[PDB]
């Protein structure tokens, strides 16, 4: 019957939408890898920033290492 053949033909009309859905799925699986690599980027580039920005970005936890040299002069 024409009706059934029409339904079967039309079953795949929306190919592009299904492909967009596929884009969504694979990117959802992939994108969390940005966190490891982001941490490492920041790890490497932290000692390049100004001392003030190092102190700020760590909420004051980070401070200049104390190795027993270059102390104040009376």
């Amino acid at each position: 019957s024409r009706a059934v053949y029409a339904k079967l033909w039309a079953s795949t009309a929306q190919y592009t939408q299904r492909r967009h859905y596929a884009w969504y799925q694979i990117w959802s699986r992939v994108i969390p890898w940005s966190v490891p690599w982001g941490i490492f980027a920041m790890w490497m580039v932290f000692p390049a920033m100004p001392v003030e920005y190092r102190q700020a970005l760590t909420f004051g936890i980070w401070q200049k290492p104390n190795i027993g040299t270059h102390g104040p002069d009376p």
């Binding site: 890898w33 490891p36 027993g68």
Partner: protein
């Protein structure tokens, strides 16, 4: 082993490899710095009165 299994570290942070990597990176970041500051303190503790800061110069 029962204690470790009770902490449920595996379920949340080590069973998925993306989280495994997140864990590795962050624990690296923090542990390295703690280890460094601890060795700094030891180096100051053993060498007290020998380092530059511990014995100020007094001008004539």
């Amino acid at each position: 082993f029962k204690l470790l299994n009770a902490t449920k570290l595996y379920e949340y942070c080590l069973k998925d490899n993306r989280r495994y990597c997140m864990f590795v990176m962050g624990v690296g970041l923090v542990s390295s710095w703690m280890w460094s500051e601890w060795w700094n303190s030891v180096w100051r503790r053993i060498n007290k009165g020998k380092l530059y800061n511990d014995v100020p110069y007094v001008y004539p």
